[PDB]
Amino acid sequence: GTILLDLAPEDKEYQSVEEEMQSTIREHRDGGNAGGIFNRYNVIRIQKVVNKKLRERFCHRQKEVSEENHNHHNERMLFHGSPFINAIIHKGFDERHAYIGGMFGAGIYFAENSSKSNQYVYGIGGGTGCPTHKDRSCYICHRQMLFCRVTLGKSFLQFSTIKMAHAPPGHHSVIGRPSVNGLAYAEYVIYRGEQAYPEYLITYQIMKP
């Protein structure tokens, strides 16, 4: 039931998304190992993901969370990267595919920094990089990430690794927060797929500095 609406680069909605993507790039602690060395993307395409059933599921859950959290669903626009974008835009996020070994356990991970999500596009820690050149810093091959609506509800703030299966009691999400001698950039984790909607599909390259 998914329809992808291609946005014209002249569209202000396209430009809004690209601006968020470009302006949230950060220098990463790993010197570029996972996601590559760049300070700018070349955006190839931005598509709006239209899926009535997925939207219904997302909205139903958002209403529940809102009622459970003093009428604040705390929706945030956040980036997601993984090798599973094609499945996500058709069937949604599915925590049954999330396993307990992750830094914050069996959840679906999002970032406020696009360059953090870019570290996951080819796998955890960038995997082995692009299929053709096996280069995590490939400047040739195309990449995709999502810019998603994410229902956070009441977030549990976590500063170090804790492998949990579900949000803590009374909460709807976990935020891995920067701390001294800890994380550098925030990571946002939900443990129910229906708390995210894959609003925008971005096709891009990283650019060589």
Ligand X SMILES: CCN(C(=O)C1CCN(S(=O)(=O)c2cc3c(ccn3C(C)=O)cc2Br)CC1)c1cccc(C)c1
Q: Least distance in Å: CB of 119 to ligand X?
A: 8
Residue with Cβ nearer Cl ion (5 or 100):
5
Smallest Cα–Cα separation from 136: which of 146, 147, 124, 148?
A: 124
Among 8, 44, 87, 140, binds Zn ion (CB under 5 A): 140
Tell me what percent of the chain is helix, strand and coil, each rounded to the nearest 5.
25, 30, 50
By CB atoms closer than 10 A (0-12, 13-18, 19+), residue 102 is: middle
Instruction: Give the separation between CA 121 and CA 50, rounded to whole angstroms.
Output: 22
Tokens of 200: 């925008």
Site for Cl ion in 84-143 (CB under 5 A): 84, 86-87
CB of 98 to ligand X, least distance (A): 5
Does residue 82 belong to the site contacting ligand X (CB under 6 A)? Answer: yes
206 binds Zn ion per the rule CB under 5 A: no
The span of 3-11, 21-29, 58-66, 77-85 binding ligand X (CB under 6 A) equals 77-85
Region for 95 from its dihedrals, namely left if φ exceeds 0, alpha if ψ lies in -120 to 50, beta otherwise: alpha
Give 8 or 165: the residue with its C-beta nearer to ligand X: 165
Judged by CB under 5 A, which of 49, 89, 111, 130 binds Zn ion? 130
Interaction of residue 88 with ligand X, rule CB under 6 A:
yes
Annotated binding site for Zn(2+): 130, 133, 138, 141
C-beta separation of 145 from 86 below 8 A: no
> CB under 5 to 8 A by kind: which of Cl ion, ligand X, Zn ion, none does 82 bind?
ligand X
Interaction between residue 76 and ligand X (CB under 6 A): no
Give the residue with the Cβ less far from Cl ion, 18 or 167: 18
- Could you give the CA distance from residue 88 to residue 153 in angstroms, rounded to a whole number? 22
Check if the beta carbon of residue 47 is closer than 8 Å to that of residue 5: yes
**Residue count, binding to ligand X (CB under 6 A):** 16
Return binding residues.
130, 133, 138, 141
Residues 173-202 that bind ligand X (CB under 6 A): 193
Task: Burial-class residue 31 by CB neighbours within 10 Å (0-12, 13-18, 19+).
Answer: exposed
Site residues (vs ligand X, CB under 6 A): 82-84, 87-88, 91, 93-94, 97-98, 108-109, 120, 123-124, 193
